[PDB]
Design a protein around this ligand. Structure first.
Ligand SMILES: [Fe+3]
Ligand SMILES: [K+]
Length: 329
């Protein structure tokens, strides 16, 4: 069934990808689907490679999946991740704003604070939180990047150009767009909050649970709700900024090997899915969190035939992005 050149971003993913290829080869029959690893510096390069036919697949955050659709790459979502459980799969998750208990400020008081973002253009770490604070931001608001750097008093927005918007890398100099940046991603934005570099971390509802196994430690943290109040991390369903589409694997539209990508992932979630193997795991890793696929994922679901990004993502979230990228006050 040929090979799916998987795009790994940086060395940790590269390692897990190499492990993914070995283990798959050790079980799936010589005729089945195999995996190859193409290592890139950022998801941006991953998107260029796939569109150039030097790679075939990569998993992306909804917001990045939207971007991958715009020309001249026009990549399509082919396999989505689902969370929660296999019995009740959820193809969405909750963006939340985590903070340290007794920090003393609600949502309408973020101005002047320090922000820890998962990454620029990501749903929970950027599109959702910045969309909601769009008008609180100082004018001019365009370019957005600079208005955000001005609203807060120091941030970490991975993938942002540190040369044009220095304050966006104040909490993580260089704004590295990969695990090389320790404050990159969910658990990265959380560590930025925990080490005390920032005051708030825009991540997902499961992030803190992936980092603090003891409730005692977690009680020293809270969520900022939309009604300008705070609630425990356990109460995200009623204290989140928004609900968003699940991360999804994207591929080319022509000669995209979507059937093979899915066949590879479906067989892979049976062999190495949640609690399935003692040799290898798809949704966890000894080299780091959320490498290739997010840790909170429980499996995969095949995206309907020929579906494009707009359709998959859905109108509500597409609008949310269009509004943030346009919108007025
Ligand atoms: Fe995300
Ligand atoms: K500022």
């Amino acid at each position: 069934d040929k090979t799916v050149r998987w795009c790994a971003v940086s060395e940790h993913e590269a390692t897990k990808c190499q492990s993914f290829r070995d283990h798959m080869k050790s079980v799936i029959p010589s005729d089945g689907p195999s995996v190859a690893c193409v290592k890139k510096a950022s998801y941006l390069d991953c998107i260029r490679a796939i569109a150039a036919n030097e790679a075939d697949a990569v998993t992306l955050d909804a917001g990045l999946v939207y971007d991958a659709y715009l020309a001249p790459n026009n990549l399509k979502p082919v396999v989505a991740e689902f969370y929660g459980s296999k019995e009740d799969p959820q193809t969405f998750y909750y963006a939340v704003a985590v903070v340290k208990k007794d920090s003393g400020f609600q949502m309408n008081q973020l101005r002047g604070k320090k922000s820890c973002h998962t990454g620029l253009g990501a749903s929970a770490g950027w599109n959702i939180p910045i969309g909601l604070l769009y008008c609180d931001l100082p004018e001019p608001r365009k370019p957005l990047e600079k208005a955000v750097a001005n609203f807060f008093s120091g941030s970490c927005a991975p993938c942002a150009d540190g040369t044009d918007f220095p304050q966006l890398c104040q909490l993580c100099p260089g704004c590295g767009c990969s695990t090389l940046n320790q404050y990159f991603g969910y658990s990265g934005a959380f560590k930025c909050l925990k080490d005390g570099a920032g005051d708030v971390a825009f991540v997902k509802h499961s992030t803190i649970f992936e980092n603090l196994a003891n409730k005692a430690d977690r009680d020293q943290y809270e969520l900022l709700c939309l009604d300008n109040t705070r609630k425990p991390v356990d109460e995200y369903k009623d204290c989140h900024l928004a609900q968003v589409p699940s991360h999804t694997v994207v591929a080319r539209s022509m000669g995209g090997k979507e059937d093979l990508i899915w066949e590879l992932l479906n067989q892979a979630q049976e062999h190495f899915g949640k609690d399935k193997s003692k040799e290898f795991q798809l949704f966890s890793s000894p080299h780091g969190k959320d490498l290739l696929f997010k840790d909170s994922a429980h499996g995969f679901l095949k995206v309907p035939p020929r579906m494009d990004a707009k359709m998959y993502l859905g109108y509500e979230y597409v609008t949310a992005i269009r509004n943030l990228r346009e919108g007025t006050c």
